GROMACS .gro file of C-alpha atoms in nm:
model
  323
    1UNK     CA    1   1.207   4.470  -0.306
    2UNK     CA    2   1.114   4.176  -0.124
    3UNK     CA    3   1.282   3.895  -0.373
    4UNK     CA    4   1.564   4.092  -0.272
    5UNK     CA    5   1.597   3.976   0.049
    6UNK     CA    6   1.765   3.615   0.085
    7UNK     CA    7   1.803   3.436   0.397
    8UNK     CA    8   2.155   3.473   0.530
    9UNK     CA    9   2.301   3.116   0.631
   10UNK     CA   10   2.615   3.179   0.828
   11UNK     CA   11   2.819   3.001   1.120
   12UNK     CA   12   2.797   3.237   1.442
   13UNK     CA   13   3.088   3.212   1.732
   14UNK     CA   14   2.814   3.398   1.949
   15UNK     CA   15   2.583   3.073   1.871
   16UNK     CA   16   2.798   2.836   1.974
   17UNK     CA   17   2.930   3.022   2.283
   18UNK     CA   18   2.570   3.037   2.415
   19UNK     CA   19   2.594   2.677   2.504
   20UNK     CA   20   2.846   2.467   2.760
   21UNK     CA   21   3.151   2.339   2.534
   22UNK     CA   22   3.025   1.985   2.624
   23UNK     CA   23   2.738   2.026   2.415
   24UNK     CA   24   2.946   1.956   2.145
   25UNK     CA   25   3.083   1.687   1.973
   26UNK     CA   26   3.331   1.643   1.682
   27UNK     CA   27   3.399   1.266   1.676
   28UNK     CA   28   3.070   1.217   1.496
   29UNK     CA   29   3.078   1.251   1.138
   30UNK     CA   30   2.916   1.521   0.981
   31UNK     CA   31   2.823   1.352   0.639
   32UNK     CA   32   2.637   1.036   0.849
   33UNK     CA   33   2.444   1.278   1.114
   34UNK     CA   34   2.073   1.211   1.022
   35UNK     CA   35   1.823   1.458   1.225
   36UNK     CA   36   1.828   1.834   1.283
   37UNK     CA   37   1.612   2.080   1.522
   38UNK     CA   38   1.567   2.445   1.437
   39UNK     CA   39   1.406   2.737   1.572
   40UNK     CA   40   1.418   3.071   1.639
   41UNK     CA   41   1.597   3.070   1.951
   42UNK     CA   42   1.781   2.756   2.080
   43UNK     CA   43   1.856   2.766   2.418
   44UNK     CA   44   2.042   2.510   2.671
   45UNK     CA   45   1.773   2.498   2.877
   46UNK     CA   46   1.548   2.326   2.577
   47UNK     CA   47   1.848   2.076   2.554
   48UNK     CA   48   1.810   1.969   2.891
   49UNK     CA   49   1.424   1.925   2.841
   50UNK     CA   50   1.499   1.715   2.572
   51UNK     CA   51   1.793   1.511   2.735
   52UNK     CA   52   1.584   1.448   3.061
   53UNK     CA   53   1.277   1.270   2.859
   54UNK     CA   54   1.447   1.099   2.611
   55UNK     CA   55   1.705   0.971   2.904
   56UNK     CA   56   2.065   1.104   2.685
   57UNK     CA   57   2.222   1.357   2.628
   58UNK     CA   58   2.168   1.465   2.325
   59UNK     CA   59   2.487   1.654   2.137
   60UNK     CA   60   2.524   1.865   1.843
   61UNK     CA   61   2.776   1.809   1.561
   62UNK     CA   62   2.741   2.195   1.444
   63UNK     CA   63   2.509   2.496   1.454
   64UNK     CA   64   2.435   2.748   1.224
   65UNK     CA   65   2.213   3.011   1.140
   66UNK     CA   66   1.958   3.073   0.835
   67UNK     CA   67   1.840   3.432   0.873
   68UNK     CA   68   1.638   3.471   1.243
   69UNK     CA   69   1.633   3.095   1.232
   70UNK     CA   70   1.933   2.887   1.469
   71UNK     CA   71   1.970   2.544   1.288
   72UNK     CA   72   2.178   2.234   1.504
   73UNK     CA   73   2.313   1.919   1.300
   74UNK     CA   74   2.199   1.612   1.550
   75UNK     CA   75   2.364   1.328   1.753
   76UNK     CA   76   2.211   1.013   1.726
   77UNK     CA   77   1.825   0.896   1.603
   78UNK     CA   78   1.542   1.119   1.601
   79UNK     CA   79   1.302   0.852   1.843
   80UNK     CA   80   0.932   0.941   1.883
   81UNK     CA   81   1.010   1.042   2.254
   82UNK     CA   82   1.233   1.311   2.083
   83UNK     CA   83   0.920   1.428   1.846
   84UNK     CA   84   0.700   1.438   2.136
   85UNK     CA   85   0.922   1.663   2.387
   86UNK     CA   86   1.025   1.874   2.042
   87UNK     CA   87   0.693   1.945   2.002
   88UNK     CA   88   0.607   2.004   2.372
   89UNK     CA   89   0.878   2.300   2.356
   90UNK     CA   90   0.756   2.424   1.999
   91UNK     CA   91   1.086   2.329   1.787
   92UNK     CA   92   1.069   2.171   1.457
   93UNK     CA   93   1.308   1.890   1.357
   94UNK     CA   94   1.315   1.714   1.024
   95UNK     CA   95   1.551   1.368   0.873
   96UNK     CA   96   1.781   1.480   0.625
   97UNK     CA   97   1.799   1.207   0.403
   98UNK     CA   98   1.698   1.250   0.034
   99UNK     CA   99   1.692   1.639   0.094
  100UNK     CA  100   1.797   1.800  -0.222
  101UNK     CA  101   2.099   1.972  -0.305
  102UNK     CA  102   2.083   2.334  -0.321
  103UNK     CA  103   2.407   2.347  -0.529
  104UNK     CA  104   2.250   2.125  -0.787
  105UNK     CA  105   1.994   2.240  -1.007
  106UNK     CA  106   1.659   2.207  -0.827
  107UNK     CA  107   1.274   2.326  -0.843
  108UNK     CA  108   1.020   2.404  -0.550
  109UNK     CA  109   0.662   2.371  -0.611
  110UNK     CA  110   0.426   2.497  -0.330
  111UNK     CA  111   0.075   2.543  -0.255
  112UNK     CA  112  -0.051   2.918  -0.221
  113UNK     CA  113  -0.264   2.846   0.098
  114UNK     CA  114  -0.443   2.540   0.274
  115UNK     CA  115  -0.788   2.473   0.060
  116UNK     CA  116  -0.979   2.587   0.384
  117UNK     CA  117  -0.782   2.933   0.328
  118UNK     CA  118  -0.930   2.925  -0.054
  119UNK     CA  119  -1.210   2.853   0.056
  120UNK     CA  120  -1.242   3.158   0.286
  121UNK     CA  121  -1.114   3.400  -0.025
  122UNK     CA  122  -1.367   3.257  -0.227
  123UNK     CA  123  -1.661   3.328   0.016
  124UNK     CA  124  -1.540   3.694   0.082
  125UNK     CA  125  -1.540   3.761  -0.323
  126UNK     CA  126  -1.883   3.562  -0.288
  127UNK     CA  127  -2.019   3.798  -0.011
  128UNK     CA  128  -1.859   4.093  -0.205
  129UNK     CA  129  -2.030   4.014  -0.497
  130UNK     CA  130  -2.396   3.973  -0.355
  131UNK     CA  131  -2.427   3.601  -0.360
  132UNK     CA  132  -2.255   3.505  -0.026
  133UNK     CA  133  -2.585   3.232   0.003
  134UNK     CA  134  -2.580   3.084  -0.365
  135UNK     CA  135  -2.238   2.984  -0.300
  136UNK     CA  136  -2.334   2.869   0.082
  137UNK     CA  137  -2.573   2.648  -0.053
  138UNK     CA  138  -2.358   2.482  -0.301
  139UNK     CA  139  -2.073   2.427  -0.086
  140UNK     CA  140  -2.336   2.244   0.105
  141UNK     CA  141  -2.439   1.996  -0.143
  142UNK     CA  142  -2.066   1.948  -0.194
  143UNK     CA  143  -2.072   1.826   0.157
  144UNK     CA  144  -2.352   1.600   0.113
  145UNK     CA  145  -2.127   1.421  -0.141
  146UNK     CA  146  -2.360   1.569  -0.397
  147UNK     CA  147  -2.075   1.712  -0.618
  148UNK     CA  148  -1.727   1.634  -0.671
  149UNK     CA  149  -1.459   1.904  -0.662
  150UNK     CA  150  -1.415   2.000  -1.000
  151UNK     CA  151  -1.829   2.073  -0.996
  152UNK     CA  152  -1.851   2.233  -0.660
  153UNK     CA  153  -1.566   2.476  -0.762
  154UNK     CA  154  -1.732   2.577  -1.123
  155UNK     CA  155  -2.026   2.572  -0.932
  156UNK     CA  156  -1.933   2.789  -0.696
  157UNK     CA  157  -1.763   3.011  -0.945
  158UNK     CA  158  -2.090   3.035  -1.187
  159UNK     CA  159  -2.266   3.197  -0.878
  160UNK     CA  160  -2.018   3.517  -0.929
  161UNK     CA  161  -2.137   3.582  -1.269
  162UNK     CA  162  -2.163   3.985  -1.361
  163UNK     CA  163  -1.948   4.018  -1.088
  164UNK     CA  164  -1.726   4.322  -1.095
  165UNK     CA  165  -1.407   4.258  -1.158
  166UNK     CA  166  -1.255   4.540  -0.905
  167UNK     CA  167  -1.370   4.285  -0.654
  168UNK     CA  168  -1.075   4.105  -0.688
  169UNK     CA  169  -0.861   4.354  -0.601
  170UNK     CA  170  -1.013   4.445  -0.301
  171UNK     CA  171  -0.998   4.120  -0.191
  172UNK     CA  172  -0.626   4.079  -0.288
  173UNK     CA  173  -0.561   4.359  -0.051
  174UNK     CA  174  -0.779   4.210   0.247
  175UNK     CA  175  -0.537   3.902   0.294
  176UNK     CA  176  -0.167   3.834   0.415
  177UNK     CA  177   0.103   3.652   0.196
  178UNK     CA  178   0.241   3.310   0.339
  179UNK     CA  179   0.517   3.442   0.628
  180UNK     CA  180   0.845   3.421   0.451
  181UNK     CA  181   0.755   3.352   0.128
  182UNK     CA  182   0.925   3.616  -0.023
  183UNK     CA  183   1.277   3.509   0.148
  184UNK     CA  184   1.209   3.143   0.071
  185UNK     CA  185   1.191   3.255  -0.337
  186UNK     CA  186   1.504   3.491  -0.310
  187UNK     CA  187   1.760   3.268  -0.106
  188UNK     CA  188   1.639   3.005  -0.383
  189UNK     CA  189   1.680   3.209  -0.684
  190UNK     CA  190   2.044   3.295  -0.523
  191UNK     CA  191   2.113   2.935  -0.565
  192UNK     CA  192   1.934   2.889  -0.877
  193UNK     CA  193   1.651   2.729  -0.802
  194UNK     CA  194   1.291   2.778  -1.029
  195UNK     CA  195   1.035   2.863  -0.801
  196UNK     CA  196   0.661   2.744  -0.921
  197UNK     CA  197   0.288   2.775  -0.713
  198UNK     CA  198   0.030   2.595  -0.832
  199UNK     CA  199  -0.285   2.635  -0.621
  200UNK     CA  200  -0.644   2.601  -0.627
  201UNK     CA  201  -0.727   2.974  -0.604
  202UNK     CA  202  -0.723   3.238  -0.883
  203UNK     CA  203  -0.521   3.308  -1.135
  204UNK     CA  204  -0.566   3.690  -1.081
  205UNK     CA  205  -0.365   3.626  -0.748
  206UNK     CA  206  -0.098   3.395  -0.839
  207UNK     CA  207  -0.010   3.558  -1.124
  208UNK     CA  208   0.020   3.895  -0.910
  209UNK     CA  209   0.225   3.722  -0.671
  210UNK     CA  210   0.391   3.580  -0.930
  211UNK     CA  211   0.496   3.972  -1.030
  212UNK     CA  212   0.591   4.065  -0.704
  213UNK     CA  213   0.777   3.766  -0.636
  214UNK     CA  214   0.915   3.708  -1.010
  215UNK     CA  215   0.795   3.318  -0.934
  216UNK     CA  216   0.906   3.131  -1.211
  217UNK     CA  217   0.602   2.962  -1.276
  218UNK     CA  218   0.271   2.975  -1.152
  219UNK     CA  219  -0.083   2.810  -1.189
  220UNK     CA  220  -0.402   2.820  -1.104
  221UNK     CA  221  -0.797   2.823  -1.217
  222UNK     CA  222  -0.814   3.130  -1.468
  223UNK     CA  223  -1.160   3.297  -1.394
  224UNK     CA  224  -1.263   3.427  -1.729
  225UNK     CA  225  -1.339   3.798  -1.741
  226UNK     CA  226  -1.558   3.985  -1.982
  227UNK     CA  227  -1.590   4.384  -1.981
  228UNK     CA  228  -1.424   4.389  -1.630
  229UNK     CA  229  -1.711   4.154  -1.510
  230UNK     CA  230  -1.654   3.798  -1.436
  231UNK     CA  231  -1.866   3.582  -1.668
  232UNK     CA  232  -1.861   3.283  -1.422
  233UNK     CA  233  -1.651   3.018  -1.611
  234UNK     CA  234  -1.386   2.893  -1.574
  235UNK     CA  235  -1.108   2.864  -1.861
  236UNK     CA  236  -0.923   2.580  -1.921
  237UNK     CA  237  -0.851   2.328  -1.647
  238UNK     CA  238  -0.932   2.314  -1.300
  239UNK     CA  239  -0.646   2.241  -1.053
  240UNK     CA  240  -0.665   1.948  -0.897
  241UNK     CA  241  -0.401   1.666  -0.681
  242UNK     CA  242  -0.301   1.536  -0.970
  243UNK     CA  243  -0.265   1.877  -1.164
  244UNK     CA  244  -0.009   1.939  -0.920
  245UNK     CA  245   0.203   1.642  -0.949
  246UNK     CA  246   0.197   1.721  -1.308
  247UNK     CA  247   0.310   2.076  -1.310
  248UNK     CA  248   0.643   1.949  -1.066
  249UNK     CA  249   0.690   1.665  -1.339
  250UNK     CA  250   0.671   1.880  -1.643
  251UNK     CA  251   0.883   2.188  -1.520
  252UNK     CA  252   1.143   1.918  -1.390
  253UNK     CA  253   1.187   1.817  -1.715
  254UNK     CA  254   1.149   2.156  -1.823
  255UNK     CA  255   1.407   2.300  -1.605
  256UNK     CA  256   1.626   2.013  -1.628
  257UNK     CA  257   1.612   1.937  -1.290
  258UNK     CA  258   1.631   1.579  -1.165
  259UNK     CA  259   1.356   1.441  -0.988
  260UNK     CA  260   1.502   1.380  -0.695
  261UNK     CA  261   1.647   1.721  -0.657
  262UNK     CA  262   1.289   1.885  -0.604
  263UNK     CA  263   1.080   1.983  -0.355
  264UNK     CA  264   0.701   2.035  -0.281
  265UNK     CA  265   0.538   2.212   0.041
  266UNK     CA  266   0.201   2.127   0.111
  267UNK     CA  267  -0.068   2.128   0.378
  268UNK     CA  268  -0.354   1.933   0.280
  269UNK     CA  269  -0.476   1.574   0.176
  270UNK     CA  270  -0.523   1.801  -0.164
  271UNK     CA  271  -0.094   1.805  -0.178
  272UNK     CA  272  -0.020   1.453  -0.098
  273UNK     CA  273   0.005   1.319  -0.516
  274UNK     CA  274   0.232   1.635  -0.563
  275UNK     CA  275   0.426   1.543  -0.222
  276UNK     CA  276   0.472   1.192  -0.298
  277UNK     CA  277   0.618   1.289  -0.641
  278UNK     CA  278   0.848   1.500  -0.541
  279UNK     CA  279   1.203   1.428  -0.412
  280UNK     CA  280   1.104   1.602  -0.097
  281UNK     CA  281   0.772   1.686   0.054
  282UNK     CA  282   0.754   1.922   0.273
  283UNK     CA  283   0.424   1.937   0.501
  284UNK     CA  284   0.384   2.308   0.609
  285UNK     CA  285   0.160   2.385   0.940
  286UNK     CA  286  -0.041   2.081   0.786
  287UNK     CA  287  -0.280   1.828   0.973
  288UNK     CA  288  -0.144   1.552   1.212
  289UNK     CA  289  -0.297   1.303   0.924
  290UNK     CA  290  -0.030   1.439   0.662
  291UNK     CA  291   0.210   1.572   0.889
  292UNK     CA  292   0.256   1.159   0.933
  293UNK     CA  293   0.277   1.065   0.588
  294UNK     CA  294   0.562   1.347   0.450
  295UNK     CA  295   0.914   1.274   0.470
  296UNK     CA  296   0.956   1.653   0.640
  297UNK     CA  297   0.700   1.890   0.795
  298UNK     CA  298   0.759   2.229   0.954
  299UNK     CA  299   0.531   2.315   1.238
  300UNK     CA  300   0.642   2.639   1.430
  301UNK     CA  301   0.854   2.800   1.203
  302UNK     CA  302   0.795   3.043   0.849
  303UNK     CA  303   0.853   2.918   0.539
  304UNK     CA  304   1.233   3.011   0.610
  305UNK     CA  305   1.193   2.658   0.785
  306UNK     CA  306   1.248   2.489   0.431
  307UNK     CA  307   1.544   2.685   0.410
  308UNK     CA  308   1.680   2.535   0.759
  309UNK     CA  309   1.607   2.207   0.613
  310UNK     CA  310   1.741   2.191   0.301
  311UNK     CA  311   2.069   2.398   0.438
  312UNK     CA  312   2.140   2.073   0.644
  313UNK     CA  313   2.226   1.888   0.308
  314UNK     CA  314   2.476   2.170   0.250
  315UNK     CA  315   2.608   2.187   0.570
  316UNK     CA  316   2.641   1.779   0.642
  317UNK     CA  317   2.807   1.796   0.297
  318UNK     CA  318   3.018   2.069   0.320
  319UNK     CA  319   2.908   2.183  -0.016
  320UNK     CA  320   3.067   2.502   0.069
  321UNK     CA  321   3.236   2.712   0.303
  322UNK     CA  322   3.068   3.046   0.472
  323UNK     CA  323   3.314   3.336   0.467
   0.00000   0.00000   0.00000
């Protein structure tokens, strides 16, 4: 029931009424405002921590909400004195130039979890399966430069061979989807989006999550399984950087979709080909090192974040009205 539940985006009196009616601005046009901030809860008294270090006062054009999230449409430049005081108070802000239209056709592709979060699931079906060390040792001579990724991963992977397959369940079980995910692939889906993961875990996950979720498309590397064992190869290709660029290219076309009307959330070095492909990258509780090099990153907030940004497109556009 979870792809069932979209993120509402609505205009609230109550938001607006929270802050002084000076706040506010409507000479400003909408359609050339350039920066918004979003959270959960947007206070005045964050305003004036911003306005006091970057010496103005700041104003919004317009407020809104996207479910628990509390979007405002910004005055002005976002200057790295406004990044660093953001930051300091735990709000995300993004530039909304070159997001995507929602009322277009579009297509997200994101990343199922950071490769250090794969790389956790991988040693817990390791240490399930009795060869917690075997694997240990080979994701040391990976770090010794030894092997390359594709090798370390098959590697790895040969290690769990005879493995039960029940052991991928019970892992499955042991570990959290992304928060929000599920209302980031429904309030797409409302507006017709295609939806596709492509990670560097399992296929036995993503294409579980792809049930639950009814994910449009997902990849991954397909462990093969013999007599409910795994036989400790790997079919077909194994997901790489570039794998992932190609997946957004191909469904694009695909789907239809233009190129500039997609997105792509990532968090590592691992997502920057599919980022840099995409009409939008999004960097998603990602390191400082590609935090700096994605158009957009959210820091603080749930995937719903994505939502907040790509609503700003809407909203500066007045691609529709709310009630």
């Amino acid at each position: 029931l979870d792809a069932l539940t979209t993120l509402p985006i609505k205009k609230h009196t109550a938001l607006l009424n929270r802050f002084p009616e000076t706040r506010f601005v409507t000479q400003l046009a909408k359609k050339r405002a350039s920066w918004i901030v979003f959270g959960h809860y947007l206070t005045p008294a964050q305003f004036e921590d911003m306005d006091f270090f970057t010496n103005r006062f700041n104003a919004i054009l317009d407020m809104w909400k996207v479910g628990r999230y509390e979007v405002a449409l910004m005055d002005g430049e976002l200057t790295s004195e406004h990044e660093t005081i953001l930051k300091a108070l735990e709000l995300d802000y993004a530039r909304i130039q070159d997001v995507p239209d929602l009322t277009k056709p579009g297509l997200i592709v994101l990343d199922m979890d950071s490769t250090a979060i794969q790389i956790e699931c991988i040693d817990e079906i390791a240490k399930l399966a009795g060869v917690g060390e075997e694997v240990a040792e080979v994701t040391e001579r990976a770090m010794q430069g030894e092997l390359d990724f594709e090798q370390s991963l098959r590697l790895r992977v040969s290690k769990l061979k005879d493995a039960p397959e029940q052991i991928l369940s019970q892992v499955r079980e042991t570990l959290p989807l992304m928060p929000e995910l599920p209302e980031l692939v429904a309030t797409l889906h409302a507006f017709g989006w295609k939806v596709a993961i492509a990670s560097g875990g399992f296929t036995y996950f993503s294409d579980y999550l792809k049930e639950q979720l009814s994910l449009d498309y997902a990849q991954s590397n397909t462990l093969e399984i013999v007599s409910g064992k795994l036989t400790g190869q790997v079919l077909g290709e194994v997901v790489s950087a570039q794998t992932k660029a190609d997946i957004l290219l191909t469904l694009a076309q695909q789907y239809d979709v233009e190129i500039h009307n997609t997105v792509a959330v990532g968090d590592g070095a691992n997502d920057l080909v599919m980022m840099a492909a995409a009409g939008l990258g999004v960097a998603y509780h990602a390191k400082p090192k590609v935090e700096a090099k994605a158009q957009t990153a959210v820091r603080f907030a749930g995937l719903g974040g994505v939502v907040c940004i790509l609503s700003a497109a809407l909203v500066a556009q007045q691609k529709l009205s709310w009630k």
